[PDB]
């Protein structure tokens, strides 16, 4: 289904040039959200009341009002080992790096 | 800029058939969010670490979409309706009005 779902996304830090600060991991799975937001809206994708209304209004008049976007609704972190602006080695947890679930917003 | 912005959207309750339930208000401004997310690190676009990374992947790989413009702060709104005893009653509804947009 072209419905809002979660998809693979391989992030390669070497391809962005961040080999320089980052030591590990240099690649991770981040996923992304793509798909149609339209009725019927699965309730386990906890859509906001606003998103319901926008879907309604887009259902009534798709000109002038567009549908909601498939985007992440729960994220998890990864920890990165890298070298500081001060040239130290550190291990920091970065929030909102991996998509755990998608939804309409 | 056609970038991520809030846009006007008024939901009239006559036009959807709800005004014989909601005695007030007659409608409300919900707004919607729409626009491009080319640089989600813009301080005004509240963004996620994920949106920034993904938008970066997009510039090198067009088959990965950019981050989507969505609401990032929603406020409630109150309506008035009739009780089981035909008493006027207020009821708050959460997450109804876009206050700010952002990239996700």
Author numbering:
A (entry chain B): 16 to 120
B (entry chain A): 11 to 114
Quote from the publication.
Like other TGFβ proteins, BMPs are produced as single-chain polypeptides consisting of a larger pro-domain (30–40 kDa) and a smaller (12–15 kDa) mature signaling domain separated by one or more proteolytic cleavage sites. Signaling occurs when the mature domain, structurally reminiscent of two clasped hands complete with four β-strand “fingers” and a “wrist” helix for each monomer, combines two type 1 and two type 2 serine-threonine kinase receptors on the cell surface leading to intracellular cross-phosphorylation of the type 1 receptors and subsequent phosphorylation of specific SMAD transcription factors. For example, BMP2 can signal through the type 1 receptors Alk3 and Alk6 but maintains a higher affinity for Alk3. Growth and Differentiation Factor 5 (GDF5), on the other hand, strongly prefers signaling through Alk6 as compared to Alk3, leading to differences in signaling outcomes.
Using this protein, we were able to readily solve the X-ray crystal structure of BMP2/GDF5 to a resolution of 2.8 Å. As expected, the BMP2/GDF5 heterodimer displays the characteristic shape of a BMP growth factor, however, the dimer clearly displays an asymmetrical appearance. Here, due to the asymmetry of the ligand, the asymmetric unit consists of two full dimers. Compared to the apo-BMP structure, the BMP2 half of the heterodimer displays much less curvature in the β-strands that form the “fingers” of the BMP fold. In contrast, the GDF5 half exhibits slightly increased curvature of the β-strands compared to apo-GDF5. Thus, the fingers of the heterodimer can be described as opening on the BMP2 side and closing on the GDF5 side. This overall difference in curvature in the fingers across the dimer is responsible for the asymmetrical shape of the growth factor. The BMP2/GDF5 heterodimer possesses two unique type 1 receptor binding sites, BFGW with this inhibitory Arg located in the wrist helix and GFBW with the more permissive Ala. Indeed, superposition of both Alk3 and Alk6 into this site shows that R438 would sterically clash with Alk3, much like in homodimeric GDF5. Thus, while the BFGW site maintains the discriminatory R438 residue of GDF5, the overall shape of the pocket is more open, which might allow the receptors to position themselves slightly differently than that observed for the homodimers.
